[PDB]
Design a protein around this nucleic acid. Sequence first.
RNA 1: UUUUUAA
Length: 454
Amino acid sequence: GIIETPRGAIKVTAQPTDHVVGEYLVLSPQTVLRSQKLSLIHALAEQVKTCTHNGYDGRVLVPSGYAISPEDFQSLSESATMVYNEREFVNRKLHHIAMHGPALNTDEESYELVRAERTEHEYVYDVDQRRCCKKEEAAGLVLVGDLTNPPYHEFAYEGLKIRPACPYKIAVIGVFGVPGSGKSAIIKNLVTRQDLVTSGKKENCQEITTDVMRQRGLEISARTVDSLLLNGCNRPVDVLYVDEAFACHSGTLLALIALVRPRQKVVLCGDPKQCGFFNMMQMKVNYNHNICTQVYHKSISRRCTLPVTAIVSSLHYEGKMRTTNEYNKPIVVDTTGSTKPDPGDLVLTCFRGWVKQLQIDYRGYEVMTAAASQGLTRKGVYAVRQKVNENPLYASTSEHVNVLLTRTEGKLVWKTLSGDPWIKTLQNPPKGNFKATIKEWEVEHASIMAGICS
RNA sequence: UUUUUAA
Ligand SMILES: Nc1ncnc2c1ncn2[C@@H]1O[C@H](COP(=O)(O)OP(=O)(O)O)[C@@H](O)[C@H]1O
Ligand SMILES: [Al+3]
Ligand SMILES: [Cl-]
Ligand SMILES: [Cl-]
Ligand SMILES: [Cl-]
Ligand SMILES: [F-]
Ligand SMILES: [F-]
Ligand SMILES: [F-]
Ligand SMILES: [F-]
Ligand SMILES: [Mg+2]
């Protein structure tokens, strides 16, 4: 395609020969690297090849049709590129299993080559089309397993066909800060039926709609970012609220804003120290830029207990995080195992694979991963760890554990095996004065509400 | 059993 640089922006125009998904031009990494005027995303092209050909050489998607600021161009390119390559990656892996057989002894073995008419899986990997589809779209031999059930990677790919390629100019207020500090409370307190609430997290959506109804008697419908990107916005919007905004790449947020076209402003609420977006290819991310025109910070939690605040303040928030919660009972460590969950406890674990056995172990209880719980408040958390090893989700710096510990406003049980390195920190949280007064919180909050409403 | 997420 053609690439221009009208001062001081970048414009890519696709030509009739070009491979295009919606408004995004599909380019090979080398084509990007040959182009001097695309040098602002050469790090992206290099990162695409380093995680594809070595692990063609992948693809780089670029927004076309509009003069875009360089920073937005970078963000939109990187975000759309990750979606495209993740779909290719998953499908290529499935294609490898179907043609070369599974790699033992991995989870590749849990896939089954089956005839499309003899399976009951709703979605299916079609070996002739080289993509995942509904079972009734496939004819003959198909591969069936967890990545095809459902094929999120295909859903996200199809969403690229409607992804905006030109940022929407509007005020973007960021409210960032520590867990439990009232970022989501702001959305629940200010949302009107003329607004749109989105969330980077699915369970957080239901928490919002329920809390707005219970607290303000107002029926709203919060949607995930993915739901909006994958399904569009078919009504005018005054304020766009994005909760758990740091779970999404900046270019995804730009695409969401241009899809919604809010008439007044955008408010992003989030915490970069909690779970973000992961790339299954673990590509180095270069262009997750700040897109806010104003940024406010919250350092005082209302939810998190003193023992938990002491731990995550020290690990993740440079000791600046405090809490107004007076709960200071010790965290219960169970390696024996001497404990059972009480009614109302949220049962949490870091691994999706362990959720199955825990649901059986604790029928009637809420059970989910730490990552899926992000944004929720619970009276008690019953965390279970089935195995102790060097998995990064349980590392000391893990954002997953950060989220897990900060879900409770009171009791926390950590059920694990002896030798769990986390036991030391849990039974001996860092010392310090991590307590704040309610009015310190109120004056911090007032500064943010003054700026949001200004 | 390495984590988001559509209808
Ligand atoms: N005045 C208040 N404003 C906000 N939250 C409050 C207030 N009083 C008590 N809380 C409690 O603090 C918690 C704040 O959590 P939330 O808004 O979900 O935090 P975040 O979205 O910042 O993680 C809620 O469970 C709420 O019940
Ligand atoms: Al929170
Ligand atoms: Cl950190
Ligand atoms: Cl409190
Ligand atoms: Cl106490
Ligand atoms: F939080
Ligand atoms: F939070
Ligand atoms: F939260
Ligand atoms: F939150
Ligand atoms: Mg929240």
